Amino acid sequence: MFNLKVKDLNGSARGLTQAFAIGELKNQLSVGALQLPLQFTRTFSASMTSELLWEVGKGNIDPVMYARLFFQYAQAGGALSVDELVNQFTEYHQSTACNPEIWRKLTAYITGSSNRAIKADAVGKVPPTAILEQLRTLAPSEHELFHHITTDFVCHVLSPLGFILPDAAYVYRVGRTATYPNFYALVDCVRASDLRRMLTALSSVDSKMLQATFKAKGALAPALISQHLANAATTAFERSRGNFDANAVVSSVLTILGRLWSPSTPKELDPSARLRNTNGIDQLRSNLALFIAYQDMVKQRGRAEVIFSDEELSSTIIPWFIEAMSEVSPFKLRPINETTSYIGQTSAIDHMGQPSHVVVYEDWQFAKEITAFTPVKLANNSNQRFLDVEPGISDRMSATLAPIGNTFAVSAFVKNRTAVYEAVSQRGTVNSNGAEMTLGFPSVVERDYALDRDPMVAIAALRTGIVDESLEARASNDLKRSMFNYYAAVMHYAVAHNPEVVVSEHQGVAAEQGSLYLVWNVRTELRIPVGYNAIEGGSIRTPEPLEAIAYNKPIQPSEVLQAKVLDLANHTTSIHIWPWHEASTEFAYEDAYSVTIRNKRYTAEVKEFELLGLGQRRERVRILKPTVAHAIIQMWYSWFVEDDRTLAAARRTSRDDAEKLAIDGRRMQNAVTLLRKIEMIGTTGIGASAVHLAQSRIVDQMAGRGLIDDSSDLHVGINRHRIRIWAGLAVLQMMGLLSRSEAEALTKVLGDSNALGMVVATTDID
């Protein structure tokens, strides 16, 4: 839940405004003075890609995912750039491929014979950990990811010969890929293609002729192996050599797109009719991810300069970039209507038709699986440890979380916001301010849970535009990437729902030469402007991508948004080096149920192992964190509390009779559905066991006091509906899905309505 004023959008939400995107700290940005229309029809979006685990210790070389591990080691490791990383890798590969001594020494080691041939029967086995440990000494570097890529190259070319043990395995995690390409991401997608051309020549080395002469003769000298490896190393090194700067390719192909996008380019510096008729410029011209990447380029750099020969060189640098993009990459070209279909929109309407509140939300799918593992060391002062999954606990919690996913839809939250805003509406037009916008993105709070980050700093980043410098790099570098993604996704939604876009050029203060921005030409049939513009002429021209959402109709999401759980079950024998401790949580819990029976209070404690079917308190086990479930439940809670606070604010100043009865009936209907929801949770696996244990702890405490059994018609029903509400809160307390402060405030809201009394009043008969 992020609340913004659509009128004071500068001081309200600067982190998503286009003035901030092209360098306006002030509010000064023009209406469409000088204009040039454009029609976007494609975009480079990433796929539906989430993070996963991949293992490197085997004899395979997968070039796309070694490229991906370079991405994560360069960016998410705090290193310089994947451009510099691929440059040092080319230097390393040149030094080991143009050196004949190395490919003799580490074949002498892994064959055992320096000068004399080996027979076909006296063939032993050396594990790849040993050849890695001596490759570290022979060919030194400072990056382990080069020694891995050399190790499994030589294990790939020796594995049919039978000189290596297939035993060991070893696994890293790969990270989260952004959807919308930055300038730097375009540079990196050009370098990653050249690295993939490097590695796919190493991946094709067969040693079929070496195996054939081994079988035919019975023996082979180590010099044939040392030649057959050092030939293939140089065949990849020959692919490595003779490349373009990715920076100077992308900066030159984005600058000429700027100069033929803008309406006010000088006649001097202006692309001629040859390069303008380059095969492919007509497709890169109507592309939107390139527009926002151009804005980010001229934002960061400030200006742009050409280096290449602008007549014949640049008319054959462009299809190299087209091939780098059109290759299998993270970023694929798609139509503009495809990439942003999980967004939905609704609004609260006046009698004239004007919006008062507008809600924009992401449509999610509740993930309902969960895993419990235990970490097992290998040796002391060595973080090589690996970790064992435990069925019979993860199965219990999965079977408990699977009914809770069938009651927490995301459409049924905005559908309750709208009923609130239609039930508390007066009869009077809205003129004093624009229609305030709430945007419900569970992904913000989900990354706040996933990185252990305060939500105040993300809300502050979206509000005042800037990020904080106090927090560390592994959270700031994800905050800035997330913030760029939200700006880009807003503009894809706005352009895909208002395809009438017209490019201007900002030159008011003009701290740059030319920095472009769209405007929209949405037709409205309204009279009073939301935001601040002029509504003249049957249509409005607005520069900002959020007001163009504030004039739409209700839109329905066609696709859910999906996050998948990480994979500990399949590879359970490998050792784990990725940080398992940030993505797992400690699981221990204590709760207690109290009830007064004729002026005497009875308390029943309960622990988590008694609920989980365990007898012994185990203390090593850790749950992999349910961030999607927790984020959906947090958005639901914050919306429930906000709706109740607005109805309590409007019931006091209603000053009417029928509208006052409507507000009161709305509150009662609201609280009884909340109570039935929690009580339906408290009949699941953990909840029913908590009931059957807390009842036993109560009953064996009434043992000394002889008391007469009660009516057993209503009294059983009342005590049943109270114990189930307690169990339903306790299970969401014990899984991380609810804090104790918010469970306590939710209990206060349910208690001050006499909601259990109004529910039991419909289990009587008069």
Place this chain on the structure above:
Amino acid sequence: MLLPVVARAAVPAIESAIAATPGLVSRIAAAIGSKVSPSAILAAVKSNPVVAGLTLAQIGSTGYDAYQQLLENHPEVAEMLKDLSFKADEIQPDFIGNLGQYREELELVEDAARFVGGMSNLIRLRQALELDIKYYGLKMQLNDMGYR
């Protein structure tokens, strides 16, 4: 190069501090590592925002507003200046053995706080029990008259 938006308020405050005293000019010249002359250190301030921030750390009486303005404009000068500006504070000899005497007692505070709820719930429960009896009697009499 320092941006003019910072420089407009940053330069005359440093110049007024130099006109107040020249004894800090030798201090900032030995601190940054430039020439002792005011024109040389002012050119270093104009050409490097890190040198400007180190001068606005050496003087902070009048240069606090200019320091905040350079802070709000450039973040990277702050990210480097927190590392370049670090004074290890003096520690007492009795500090860790003194802190060992409170282990028995912070545990007792937390074992109360887990039961009561929050820290604020503990403080408000402590105040409510330490409160006077006549407030309880006033509460009972307002409930007797029919108010809640």
Place this chain on the structure above:
Amino acid sequence: MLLPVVARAAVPAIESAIAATPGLVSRIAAAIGSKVSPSAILAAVKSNPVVAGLTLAQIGSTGYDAYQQLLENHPEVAEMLKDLSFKADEIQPDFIGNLGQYREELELVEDAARFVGGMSNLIRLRQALELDIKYYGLKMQLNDMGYR
């Protein structure tokens, strides 16, 4: 930590209070728990907004504006700062026995208010019945002339 928009108003007020009197330095040193030196308590203020609010609750003449500005720009310090800043009022011995004699008055007032409407309608009705007769005559004559 403390925001600079608040701190640029907080720091000169504390500086003026310390320059005005040194006894309040010892007062805030005993109240917060910092060292008695002005540099230490000023560092505690600049480090922690709760400590800044406790100092602005200690000094009250020139610190009210900075205190309210901190309460504006820090909404999350407010409940804990209220729980820490609590002085119980001194209740009189005669108050609840004095209140016990107004149950006769208040019940009659509430019955008449439930008859009329709201308390605002009761007050407006009482003022209209207490109002002068010439207003009734004026209302009758303005209705007689064709005005409503």
Place this chain on the structure above:
Amino acid sequence: MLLPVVARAAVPAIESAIAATPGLVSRIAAAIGSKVSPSAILAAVKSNPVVAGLTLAQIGSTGYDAYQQLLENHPEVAEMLKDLSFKADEIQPDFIGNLGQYREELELVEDAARFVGGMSNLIRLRQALELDIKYYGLKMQLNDMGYR
């Protein structure tokens, strides 16, 4: 409670009024129902915005800006403050007997206004028929030259 935006402009105004004269202290203590101490009336102001509005009504020159700012930031206080802060206007002796002589006049005025148009149109028509004839001749001359 009182908003800080109101409170920053409201509290030193009441403090300056008390520092101006102490004769208003007993006046506002009798008007609200507080004790005669300025700390008591200041606690009542900071607690209840209706009491804050009554104090900013009792002091009139120095607190009119804080009164209007309270009335801006609190629309809820306005009707109850108008109900409490009421004083009856003194009526003239021959007011209604003087007003009875204007039924001849205002009927004729409204009947003329119906035929003319608006009251603004009747005022402009009265000024046009009161206006000098040289303007009519100048209009006819500019139309004689073909200017319209």
Place this chain on the structure above:
Amino acid sequence: MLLPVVARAAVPAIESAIAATPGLVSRIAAAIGSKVSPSAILAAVKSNPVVAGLTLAQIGSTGYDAYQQLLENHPEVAEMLKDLSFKADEIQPDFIGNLGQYREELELVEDAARFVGGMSNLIRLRQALELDIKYYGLKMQLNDMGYR
């Protein structure tokens, strides 16, 4: 033409410097090449922003804020103004010979930074290994009591 926002700050500062001393009027007339009269140099300043920047660089004690505001509002003029306002710095005789002695030192610094991480990480690690042992004992004791 020159911007009005720039001219409102640039014209009275130059005219104040003219009324201060006319040797600077002769100096800027020789520097730009206009006629020596104040009206002629002011008509050049109001017409050409490059000439306005040259004059606001010729007077620098009192025209610094207007000069930097011109440099804010006109970023296009900055390249040509920097090119025309350029002087060669007097280089030192022992400088490059003293610099060639430091290839042994900078290579070791950069080799250490390649192992550690960034230069910020190297500075922080050098500070930590320069730090006293009592802080390590303090962190061990807080971990011993159960505090991460």
Place this chain on the structure above:
Amino acid sequence: MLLPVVARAAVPAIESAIAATPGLVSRIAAAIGSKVSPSAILAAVKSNPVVAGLTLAQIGSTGYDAYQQLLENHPEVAEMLKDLSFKADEIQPDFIGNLGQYREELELVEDAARFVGGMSNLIRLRQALELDIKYYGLKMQLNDMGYR
């Protein structure tokens, strides 16, 4: 009709010019062509922005700020007021014959500019060749160490 934001700075400036001297009243009455009374010229200023700008061009010392503010806020009056305020500059008889002697110089400068790049590139190349040789040696030694 003049804008109020313009008029609130224009009207007291004209009033200050009238309070300075009354000869300017007769001067602007002869210039604009209105009645010589100050009320008539002050009404003409508020009635017509063209007349307002012509008055602010007649009086020059204090009216330059309000004149630039009028030129900011009124774009439509700019071309018309530039036409109405035109005076021919005095031209010298030897100016064109003195200018004719310089084509030999300017043609060579334009050819060298076409070769090098812009005039900025020509200036930078002329400075780079005019520079000392020790800078070339310093560049060579920083490349010798391996720094680029």
